[PDB]
Write a protein that binds this ligand. Structure first.
Ligand SMILES: *C(=O)/C=C/N[C@@H](C(=O)O)C(C)(C)S(=O)O
Ligand SMILES: *C(=O)/C=C/N[C@@H](C(=O)O)C(C)(C)S(=O)O
Lengths: 260, 260
């Protein structure tokens, strides 16, 4: 509508490539912008991995309480939670929360190892009907974000659809779906991103990501004041190897698509 | 010097009044800017209330498990957590988390009432050697933030000092101190405020606030990469009752005072 002109303006003024998918669950309407292009997911991939471990825990009923050893060698680049338990252990519930709410990279690595490798995360994507998602690498190299590289990519449309099934749909058993939403709603890293663009009264759960070429991402489930929930995926990447993050672009994108 | 001039330049362009107080616990140095002027606290006052409840919990030893009834008449203007428990209950631990991490205003009112009113929160401030802090009203009117009004105000210097004692000192017992810091570290609302101004590797716990006159506040305990923690208060208020919030200003303030 004007939504398209505005998104195009934002994109041009930003110097980057912008990807947006909104699903409105009141009526299944969508707002799409480069929705079928691939973008590096970076840490927004932590959602698929934690969900995969949730799913495992539907048949391995004590899985979330299993201790996992954190060695000095497991420490990656960003480890605000793991590094407090080195030469100690963390449960798989603790690791999921640390990956999701703090973006801890060591924690993500443990989730990936539990699933048997990046392949296992991709296998779960495929099990819930996501044929686009691909995880190929561990932290921190999954975040390289090199233009033209298909590794560790998905599309806004696929990720919105998947986030809808996981958070509001039936990809997970009910307890597990509640657990994921509880973890997402407690994210500590999202206030400058999608949230920044929404009315203060609306409630949000979301997972950010960032990486190379100033890749700046957010995926969110959103409960507007007095409306059915929305799903929003805002992905953004830039042409220079060491571009600065742009969480404000995401916020601008969320304001634009939710004003209507 | 360089920083005092930069702060003045930032304030000069902001359209408002900026209060800063930084304490570097490596050497107890300070950086101060309008640090003995009063500002309205808004929700940064929630720290003092949760800390008062923690203090109570040192002698009433299951206090944090105690259920509190939430009635429809309790709901204020912003209760993302409390509203799911109307005609039900929340524990004091849950009210604490809700007020700190989500800024739930019904939650804050239950903490105030557990302390005997706004007066009891002030009494606790006084018991830990804070002679500046004053809480006068309940939510939501505590955030009116009218220029010149002394209600519900403190100074950046008083709040920096208090925050240091609560989170790194011995104002509380050790478990209570750790509980507070854990709650601050899991704040969901801070990524666009002080955090936005600091390198991504630095770990932050904080409490934001906002209100009338475009008042935009953040107070934080910061664990920089490879340095002793800092304490930072950034307060900001504006001349028009309906001004928009300016979390960007706090971010910039944070960057100026941490650059070197
Ligand atoms: C999640 O999106 C990944 C976070 N890590 C990166 C970041 O930008 O925070 C690095 C650069 C620390 S690395 O890819 O781990
Ligand atoms: C904490 O700072 C509380 C915030 N409240 C206000 C805000 O600006 O967010 C309102 C307007 C929601 S209310 O006056 O409490």
């Amino acid at each position: 509508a004007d939504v398209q002109q505005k998104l195009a303006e934002l994109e041009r003024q930003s110097g980057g490539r912008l990807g947006v998918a909104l699903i409105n669950t009141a009526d299944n309407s969508q707002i799409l912008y480069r929705a079928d292009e691939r973008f590096p997911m970076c840490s927004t991939s932590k959602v698929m991995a934690a969900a995969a471990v949730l799913k495992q825990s539907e048949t391995q009923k004590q899985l979330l309480n299993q201790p996992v050893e954190i060695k000095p060698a497991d420490l990656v680049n960003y480890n605000p939670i793991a590094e407090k338990h080195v030469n100690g252990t963390m449960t798989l519930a603790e690791l999921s929360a640390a990956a999701l709410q703090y973006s801890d990279n060591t924690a993500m690595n443990k989730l990936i190892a539990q699933l048997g490798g990046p392949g296992g995360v991709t296998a779960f994507a495929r099990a819930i009907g996501d044929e686009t998602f691909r995880l190929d690498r561990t932290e921190p190299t999954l975040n390289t974000a090199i233009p033209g590289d298909p590794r560790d990519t998905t599309t806004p449309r696929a990720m919105a659809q998947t986030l809808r099934q996981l958070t509001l749909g039936h990809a997970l058993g009910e307890t597990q779906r509640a657990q994921l939403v509880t973890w997402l709603k407690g994210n500590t890293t999202g206030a400058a991103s999608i949230r920044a663009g929404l009315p203060a009264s609306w409630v949000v759960g979301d997972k950010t990501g960032s990486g190379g070429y100033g890749t700046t991402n957010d995926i969110a489930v959103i409960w507007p004041k007095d409306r059915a929930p929305l799903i929003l995926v805002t992905y953004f990447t830039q042409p220079q190897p060491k571009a600065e993050s742009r969480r404000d672009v995401l916020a601008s994108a969320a304001k634009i698509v939710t004003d209507g």
